[PDB]
Every structure is written in C-alpha cells, then in structure tokens.
C-alpha cells in the first residue's frame, strides 16, 4: 500500500499472511471461516507454505499468532495465467483456526451483490509501502 | 515490506472507466479501485478488498495486479468476488 496508514491491531481479523518455510511474507489471504482461507491464484501457494493469523507486527516476537498448515490448494479452474483472469485460489487448512478477539471471518457477497462505482472501500496488507 | 499491517480507504470505479486505463486487459471477473492517491503494491496480493454492507465487511475484491511501479494515480485491479463466490460456495460443499 503506497500511502496507507498503520492499522489498529487486531482490527482486521480475517487478514492472514502467507509465508514460505523461510518466514518470508509474499502474499495476503482472508479467512472465510475456520478451515478456509481465500487468496489470489497467481500467489502460487503450495503446502510447504503457512497461513499466519492474528499478526499485526511482522517483526514482533511477543505476539500470540497462529501458524496454520495448508492441507490442499484449490486453484479456480477458470483462472487464466495468460490474463490473470479469475485469480482466486482457495486454501483448505490442515489445522483449524482458533477464532477469537483477533481471528475471524469476513463475509462473502451474494453472486447477486451490487457494489457501485464511487463507493469507498478498504484494502489492507503487508505489501511494499514505497516501491 | 512494512512490519505491521497497513490500511487504505479507496473508491471502486466502473470496469468501463477502468478500460480507460487497462484497455482490454480488464475481464468481467475483475474489479477496479484506487487512483485516489493510494495504491496496492507487491506483497499485497491475495489480500482483502472490503466494503461495508449492512453492518458487515464483505469480501468485494482480491488484490491481483496493476502498475509495476504501484502508481497511486492508476487504479489497482482486483479479483471480483461476485463472480467467483459461486465457485467458492461450491468448493465448500464437496470438502
């Protein structure tokens, strides 16, 4: 996020971070309930990867975070790599997420759901803050 | 990459006015936003785009691509959840 502000901690409870076995954050993800994370298909997540939840400060050691293991990866079969069209991969968790004051689910819209141009919305993450 | 979690408010645009930018790169299953002075950027992918609807935050996009320079003047392109919820909804059933 270029120009974002720091979030209040635990204010975005469905935000998870995908990290490799190295510990390196490379994509975000959103908790859809306790066994299922949504992320991007281009993120190219495998099962040597992990779902970290309840994280605020990537650099803090004193955080009660949850390191969650991936069971199975579900790349939407209409995903198109040539276009990055339909860039949605579900993640099935081997380990249930323990919901709490800081770990929870976002809501999914109806296929029907309307969301109008001009409407102010919000995006979060741990991406480059200056490029 | 920042250590702690960032946030930004930003407006959604019509695909149509988006096409102004991405031309024929923008597919129905894609939803635009930004060009507001904020930008999503490398490392933010797979992450959340939320809108408030009737008390709750509802997944509206998934950070997918855009500018290679993370230009706050060009819109980011997100997955359009509306168009993939049927498939998600479905995947949940068989597992």
């Amino acid at each position: 996020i270029v120009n974002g502000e720091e979030a209040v901690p635990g204010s975005w409870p469905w935000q998870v971070s995908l990290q490799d076995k190295t510990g390196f954050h490379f994509c975000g993800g959103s908790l859809i309930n306790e066994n299922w994370v949504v992320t991007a298909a281009h993120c190219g997540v495998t099962t040597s990867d992990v779902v970290v939840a309840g994280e605020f400060d990537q650099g803090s050691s004193s955080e009660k975070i949850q390191k969650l293991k991936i069971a199975k990866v579900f790349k939407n079969s209409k995903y198109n790599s040539l276009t990055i069209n339909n860039d949605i991969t579900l993640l099935k968790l081997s380990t249930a997420a323990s919901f709490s004051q800081t770990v929870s689910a976002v809501c999914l819209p109806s296929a029907s759901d309307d969301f109008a141009a001009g409407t102010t919305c919000v995006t979060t993450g741990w991406g480059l803050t200056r490029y | 990459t920042p250590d702690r979690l960032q946030q930004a408010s930003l407006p959604l645009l019509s695909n149509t006015n988006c096409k102004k930018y991405w031309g024929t790169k923008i597919k129905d299953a894609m939803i635009c936003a930004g060009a507001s002075g904020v930008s999503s950027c490398m490392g933010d992918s797979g992450g959340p785009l939320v809108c408030k609807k009737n008390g709750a935050w509802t997944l509206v996009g998934i950070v997918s691509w855009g500018s290679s320079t993370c230009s706050t003047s060009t819109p980011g392109v997100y997955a359009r959840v509306t168009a993939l919820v049927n498939w998600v909804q479905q995947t949940l059933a068989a597992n």
């Binding site: 979030a7 209040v8 901690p9 635990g10 204010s11 975005w12 409870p13 859809i32 309930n33 709490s100 004051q101 800081t102 929870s104 689910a105 976002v106 809501c107 999914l108 919000v122 | 946030q7 408010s9 008390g55 709750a56 935050w57 509802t58």
Partner: peptide
Amino acid sequence: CGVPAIQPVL
C-alpha cells in the same frame, strides 16, 4: 462474519 471484535479506525 464481518464485524471485528476490535473496531477499525479510519
């Protein structure tokens, strides 16, 4: 779903 235990500040 969707309503934090900790409310976000913008």
